[PDB]
Amino acid sequence: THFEDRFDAREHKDRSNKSRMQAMEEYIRESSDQPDWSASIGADIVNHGRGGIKSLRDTEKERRVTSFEEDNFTRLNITNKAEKRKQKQRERNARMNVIGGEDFGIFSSKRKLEDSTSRRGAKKTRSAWDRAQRRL
Amino acid sequence: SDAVTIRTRKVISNPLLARKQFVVDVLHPNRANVSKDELREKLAEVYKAEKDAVSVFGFRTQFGGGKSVGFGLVYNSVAEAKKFEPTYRLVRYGLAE
Amino acid sequence: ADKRRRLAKQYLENLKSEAGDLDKDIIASRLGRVFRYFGDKLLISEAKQSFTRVGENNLTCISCFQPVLNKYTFEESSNGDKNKGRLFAYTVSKDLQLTKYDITDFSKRPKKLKYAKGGAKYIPTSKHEYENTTEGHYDEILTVAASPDGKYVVTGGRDRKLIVWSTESLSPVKVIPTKDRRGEVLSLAFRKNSDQLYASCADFKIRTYSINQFSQLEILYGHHDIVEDISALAMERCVTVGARDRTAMLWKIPDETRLTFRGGDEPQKLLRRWMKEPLFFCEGSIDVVSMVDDFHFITGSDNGNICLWSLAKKKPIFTERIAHGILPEPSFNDISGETDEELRKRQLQGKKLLQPFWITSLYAIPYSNVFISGSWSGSLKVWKISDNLRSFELLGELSGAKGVVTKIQVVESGKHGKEKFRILASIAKEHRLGRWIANVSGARNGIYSAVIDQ
Amino acid sequence: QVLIDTNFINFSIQKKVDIVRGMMDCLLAKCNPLITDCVMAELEKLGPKYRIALKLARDPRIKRLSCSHKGTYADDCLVHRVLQHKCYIVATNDAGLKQRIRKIPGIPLMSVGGHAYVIEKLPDVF
Amino acid sequence: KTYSTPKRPYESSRLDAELKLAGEFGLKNKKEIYRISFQLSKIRRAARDLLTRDEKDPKRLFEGNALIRRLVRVGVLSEDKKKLDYVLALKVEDFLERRLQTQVYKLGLAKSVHHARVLITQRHIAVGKQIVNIPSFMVRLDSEKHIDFAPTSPFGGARPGRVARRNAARKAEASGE
Amino acid sequence: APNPKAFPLADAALTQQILDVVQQAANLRQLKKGANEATKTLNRGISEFIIMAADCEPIEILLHLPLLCEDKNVPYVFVPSRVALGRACGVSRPVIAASITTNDASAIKTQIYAVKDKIETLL
Ligand SMILES: [Zn+2]
């Protein structure tokens, strides 16, 4: 016959941070009840209060870039186009969504949660014996 | 009075080139950004080392004071220190011309 | 809500379906738990119990320097050649006096080696709150700890000054003002085999220093109410408990990050389980704490509750109710001031006005399965933990003490096989902080000692 | 708490806006819609063409507050209520009543217009 | 935009309402009032569309839980009032309460709201660890118990300020000369 | 057989709620603490509500306060334990009756109003 048999780089790549759906992530944190590793107040606030506290995402992103330094042992620099773009966007969304350290653009957005759940979603239950097997 | 604190965080080691690796925070309340030369000597006694072989660099100070972000090394031989350092750092330490 | 848990499981499998190791390991090459289980070898019923009273009143702590030899230095981790590996007890008194005892011999009652009492001339000539460098204490010393490297010993309490003392001269070797009006030092701890000092302070702060250079390292913030008690271990951490907020919070010092553990159970909920089957109380205020390993710790509240906590969960893994018991019940003649006995009973009003004993202090030797609690029941209660680390049990009692227990320390002795443990507790008439305890008798302010072997 | 008028019911059925829903959309709050007893009189008189506007004014989510006035004039029932109490929002669309309540101070007035409802004298509109 | 002009900006009701708000909270602009009310409109609009989404819908379930819990972590909502009709019931004055300069005045570190304004901009008030100096910080719960004076502030800390020290030296010169 | 005169006490849940709010009032100077301080405040008229211990020896010396409270419609609640009230008020000694006073420059206003309703349902 004929086919390709090539490295599925895109399939061996990850999309979990793409499909993360933060409100129900927050819920599953509440349910799975492990304590949170939150920081103290001075570790929170940004720049003599000129900006907000920080977002929880921004805490995560700082922790990860600090990990890039932790292992990789090098920093970023003042590269013009990219960080100007990202810094502007993140600060604009800071001044338009986050209030006191938590964000509400998550509700002003338009990404649904049924496109994540989808009544079991992937490898879904579409036959009655599949219903029987999942119920047992 | 002043808790002369540079936390040499991100602590790792490399004995191929024989040098030790560590990041910098600077916690130093009521002090104005301690300088790398007295840091060099202070690192020299704490690591029982050479005044050239100590090598830290690139310090940025955090808000709220008594906190600075930098990026530091130490060699473990005089030959390694005198050959493997780039010359801009050699003149920052005043060892080259 | 079963729909909700269904969808949560659905997302769990969904993200599992959507979802260098040897490199990290080889770099790591290029760079704990509970390990004792001797909580059965004790011979509690035949323990030696002894008492001493001290001329001052209201002692509050003890600091037995236990010199542990290093494997990098077999001889002594203690500096001098005249200390010779003895054991020292440091006791603070609301008489504003520190007293140094030798307790090195388990046959003899502990012996006062030295003392230092501060009167009132150590108040500052100025109310400036900044310059506070009078070398002696001047109010209500409340907590003490000594250096594990035998170098210094430091006290701190309501006069907002952390004063550290020489171990030999007993001179005030350094003074540290807290630089606040509300900076009352409440609890002290050392990093084990280190010089780092952890200070719980009731302006919601946890301050940390290096003592051998007298240097204010780093500051922590975060409770709802006063940061009451603290304790450390080998790791660069601490655990602390806030009093009137029901939160015990664990601090990773260098990463500057915290974990919060609450309570959450209920007298009504215990009513419900007994319906599915007495008297229940309310989770009032988290007071005493000690951490037993790097993964579990134990805290005692005001309503008698003793709680075993694991860092894995957030809720307590093992609650224990009124364990030191129910207080002396109010007498009818003094409740009423009126003759009739039945009216006096009606004023006493049955089960409601009862009160539980507190949990005034609690201590565990590290990495063991044993911990000691103390109330003013006049009875130390010694507890042993099951090796699954999901429950403990009352091992037994030591009633050789009486009155309000305040501070509990242990001293190990003997070699690896055979070990003899002395329990040393300070007992005052009152609580550490206020008065709050109404006419218990039979107590003398001083030290209680017990010695058990094997 | 909103005092509905006969006009409002008729225009709402014309412009196909839900009463409680569209009203609660426009406020962005929670609202109790009240038909006064004399307003249901005017609907019932107006009669056999508006059997539908009646039959839809009698929803179970439209509470009824009565009235003690010998007569049937909804407009006077409403203005006397409002001139006393000043805890209400008056939903109407008549021109004469609109100018009466615009001279009264402190009483939000509410109209239907175009697609959905609009508010005038609440500052708390967004 | 980050501020939106209210659609009937000059009205008897609007106008006297803003007068009361700015006078009582010590603001200085319609712009400050507008910023708060615009973001409240977005929140409350989200909650209303959530109410349109029917009972026991998974989206309504999870996101309503999210919105309630994050508003109580911000603190404008209270612990025992966990429902979406209460997130509908909020209004502007609750956020304007949670500002920082109101919070310094309410705790009691100053006397009047304008005093608290001048303190915070004067760099004396220190939430948590840093010196905050923006009078619209929107303090949360944990910090609203942690507001107090900065340790280098001469009200709760180090040596007196420059007017005091020039004056003490001036009377020192008075006694000297 | 009938209700004793200590009625009403509070459950443990109301107890911890009230001790919580009275602590935070003592932090912020809305608390007048002690018997005749509560009395002077109930004569001035400026007190939100009254917290009376019921452990006291005897009951009577503070039992005089329900008269003034019911004279002025100001609610009162017995907590069980007087050293728990000393606990909450943060002074060093058993306080048999404290009184939370009225104010508006108050970081704890709505917390107080919630507990005031909880009392007035309990009556
Ligand atoms: Zn009518």
PDB file of C-alpha atoms in Angstrom, chain F residues 11-109:
ATOM      1  CA  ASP F  11     -24.586  27.378  71.202  1.00  0.00           C
ATOM      2  CA  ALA F  12     -20.911  26.708  70.601  1.00  0.00           C
ATOM      3  CA  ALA F  13     -21.263  28.064  67.051  1.00  0.00           C
ATOM      4  CA  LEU F  14     -22.738  31.398  68.127  1.00  0.00           C
ATOM      5  CA  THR F  15     -20.179  31.407  70.925  1.00  0.00           C
ATOM      6  CA  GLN F  16     -17.204  31.248  68.630  1.00  0.00           C
ATOM      7  CA  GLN F  17     -18.781  33.749  66.259  1.00  0.00           C
ATOM      8  CA  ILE F  18     -19.331  36.265  69.025  1.00  0.00           C
ATOM      9  CA  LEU F  19     -15.929  35.779  70.589  1.00  0.00           C
ATOM     10  CA  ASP F  20     -14.436  36.340  67.147  1.00  0.00           C
ATOM     11  CA  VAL F  21     -16.213  39.642  66.614  1.00  0.00           C
ATOM     12  CA  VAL F  22     -15.556  40.898  70.123  1.00  0.00           C
ATOM     13  CA  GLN F  23     -11.882  40.291  69.678  1.00  0.00           C
ATOM     14  CA  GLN F  24     -11.744  42.260  66.496  1.00  0.00           C
ATOM     15  CA  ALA F  25     -13.745  45.079  68.038  1.00  0.00           C
ATOM     16  CA  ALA F  26     -11.252  45.206  70.880  1.00  0.00           C
ATOM     17  CA  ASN F  27      -8.558  45.618  68.309  1.00  0.00           C
ATOM     18  CA  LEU F  28     -10.353  48.559  66.735  1.00  0.00           C
ATOM     19  CA  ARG F  29     -11.683  50.386  69.846  1.00  0.00           C
ATOM     20  CA  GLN F  30     -15.356  49.599  69.521  1.00  0.00           C
ATOM     21  CA  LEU F  31     -15.392  47.635  72.765  1.00  0.00           C
ATOM     22  CA  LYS F  32     -16.256  48.887  76.223  1.00  0.00           C
ATOM     23  CA  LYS F  33     -15.237  46.113  78.534  1.00  0.00           C
ATOM     24  CA  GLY F  34     -16.476  45.360  82.026  1.00  0.00           C
ATOM     25  CA  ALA F  35     -19.632  45.574  84.096  1.00  0.00           C
ATOM     26  CA  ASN F  36     -20.175  49.222  84.886  1.00  0.00           C
ATOM     27  CA  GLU F  37     -18.564  50.242  81.637  1.00  0.00           C
ATOM     28  CA  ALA F  38     -21.338  48.332  79.949  1.00  0.00           C
ATOM     29  CA  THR F  39     -23.748  50.026  82.278  1.00  0.00           C
ATOM     30  CA  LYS F  40     -22.532  53.554  81.560  1.00  0.00           C
ATOM     31  CA  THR F  41     -22.704  52.799  77.881  1.00  0.00           C
ATOM     32  CA  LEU F  42     -26.251  51.533  78.133  1.00  0.00           C
ATOM     33  CA  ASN F  43     -27.134  54.756  79.852  1.00  0.00           C
ATOM     34  CA  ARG F  44     -25.491  56.869  77.171  1.00  0.00           C
ATOM     35  CA  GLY F  45     -27.264  54.847  74.509  1.00  0.00           C
ATOM     36  CA  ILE F  46     -24.282  54.182  72.262  1.00  0.00           C
ATOM     37  CA  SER F  47     -23.833  50.438  72.499  1.00  0.00           C
ATOM     38  CA  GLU F  48     -24.558  47.934  69.743  1.00  0.00           C
ATOM     39  CA  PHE F  49     -25.043  44.885  71.831  1.00  0.00           C
ATOM     40  CA  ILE F  50     -24.171  43.222  75.086  1.00  0.00           C
ATOM     41  CA  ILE F  51     -22.203  40.073  75.858  1.00  0.00           C
ATOM     42  CA  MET F  52     -22.603  38.759  79.377  1.00  0.00           C
ATOM     43  CA  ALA F  53     -20.843  35.772  80.788  1.00  0.00           C
ATOM     44  CA  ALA F  54     -22.925  33.183  82.569  1.00  0.00           C
ATOM     45  CA  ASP F  55     -20.140  31.498  84.520  1.00  0.00           C
ATOM     46  CA  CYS F  56     -19.870  34.349  86.979  1.00  0.00           C
ATOM     47  CA  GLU F  57     -19.885  33.965  90.763  1.00  0.00           C
ATOM     48  CA  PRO F  58     -22.587  34.896  91.390  1.00  0.00           C
ATOM     49  CA  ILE F  59     -24.894  35.300  88.406  1.00  0.00           C
ATOM     50  CA  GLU F  60     -26.633  38.226  89.858  1.00  0.00           C
ATOM     51  CA  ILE F  61     -24.173  41.066  89.938  1.00  0.00           C
ATOM     52  CA  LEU F  62     -24.363  41.227  86.196  1.00  0.00           C
ATOM     53  CA  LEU F  63     -27.918  39.950  86.018  1.00  0.00           C
ATOM     54  CA  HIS F  64     -28.972  43.535  86.459  1.00  0.00           C
ATOM     55  CA  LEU F  65     -28.155  44.266  82.742  1.00  0.00           C
ATOM     56  CA  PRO F  66     -31.094  42.558  80.974  1.00  0.00           C
ATOM     57  CA  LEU F  67     -33.364  45.137  82.544  1.00  0.00           C
ATOM     58  CA  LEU F  68     -31.668  48.035  80.777  1.00  0.00           C
ATOM     59  CA  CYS F  69     -31.230  46.037  77.598  1.00  0.00           C
ATOM     60  CA  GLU F  70     -34.943  45.260  77.396  1.00  0.00           C
ATOM     61  CA  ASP F  71     -35.692  48.837  78.359  1.00  0.00           C
ATOM     62  CA  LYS F  72     -33.777  50.080  75.340  1.00  0.00           C
ATOM     63  CA  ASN F  73     -34.300  47.189  72.864  1.00  0.00           C
ATOM     64  CA  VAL F  74     -30.546  46.558  72.866  1.00  0.00           C
ATOM     65  CA  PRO F  75     -29.868  42.818  72.491  1.00  0.00           C
ATOM     66  CA  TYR F  76     -27.914  40.790  75.004  1.00  0.00           C
ATOM     67  CA  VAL F  77     -26.419  37.318  74.902  1.00  0.00           C
ATOM     68  CA  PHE F  78     -24.932  35.168  77.585  1.00  0.00           C
ATOM     69  CA  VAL F  79     -21.764  33.486  76.511  1.00  0.00           C
ATOM     70  CA  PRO F  80     -20.984  30.434  78.589  1.00  0.00           C
ATOM     71  CA  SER F  81     -17.517  30.989  79.912  1.00  0.00           C
ATOM     72  CA  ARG F  82     -16.100  34.078  81.527  1.00  0.00           C
ATOM     73  CA  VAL F  83     -12.532  33.179  80.931  1.00  0.00           C
ATOM     74  CA  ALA F  84     -13.421  32.693  77.289  1.00  0.00           C
ATOM     75  CA  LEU F  85     -14.659  36.230  77.339  1.00  0.00           C
ATOM     76  CA  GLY F  86     -11.361  37.293  78.863  1.00  0.00           C
ATOM     77  CA  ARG F  87      -9.747  35.290  76.063  1.00  0.00           C
ATOM     78  CA  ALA F  88     -11.566  37.224  73.408  1.00  0.00           C
ATOM     79  CA  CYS F  89     -11.371  40.724  74.859  1.00  0.00           C
ATOM     80  CA  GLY F  90      -7.647  40.393  75.182  1.00  0.00           C
ATOM     81  CA  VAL F  91      -7.263  41.999  78.545  1.00  0.00           C
ATOM     82  CA  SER F  92      -5.624  39.819  81.147  1.00  0.00           C
ATOM     83  CA  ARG F  93      -8.589  39.015  83.356  1.00  0.00           C
ATOM     84  CA  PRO F  94     -12.142  37.576  83.437  1.00  0.00           C
ATOM     85  CA  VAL F  95     -14.554  40.130  82.040  1.00  0.00           C
ATOM     86  CA  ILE F  96     -18.111  39.338  82.960  1.00  0.00           C
ATOM     87  CA  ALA F  97     -19.829  41.663  80.503  1.00  0.00           C
ATOM     88  CA  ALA F  98     -18.573  43.615  77.551  1.00  0.00           C
ATOM     89  CA  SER F  99     -20.470  45.802  75.201  1.00  0.00           C
ATOM     90  CA  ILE F 100     -19.796  46.569  71.588  1.00  0.00           C
ATOM     91  CA  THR F 101     -20.421  50.238  70.953  1.00  0.00           C
ATOM     92  CA  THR F 102     -21.808  52.043  67.979  1.00  0.00           C
ATOM     93  CA  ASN F 103     -19.529  53.561  65.327  1.00  0.00           C
ATOM     94  CA  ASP F 104     -19.270  53.882  61.579  1.00  0.00           C
ATOM     95  CA  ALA F 105     -15.546  54.399  60.948  1.00  0.00           C
ATOM     96  CA  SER F 106     -15.477  50.672  61.464  1.00  0.00           C
ATOM     97  CA  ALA F 107     -13.794  47.939  59.572  1.00  0.00           C
ATOM     98  CA  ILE F 108     -16.175  45.476  61.175  1.00  0.00           C
ATOM     99  CA  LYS F 109     -19.567  47.012  60.714  1.00  0.00           C
TER     100      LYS F 109
END
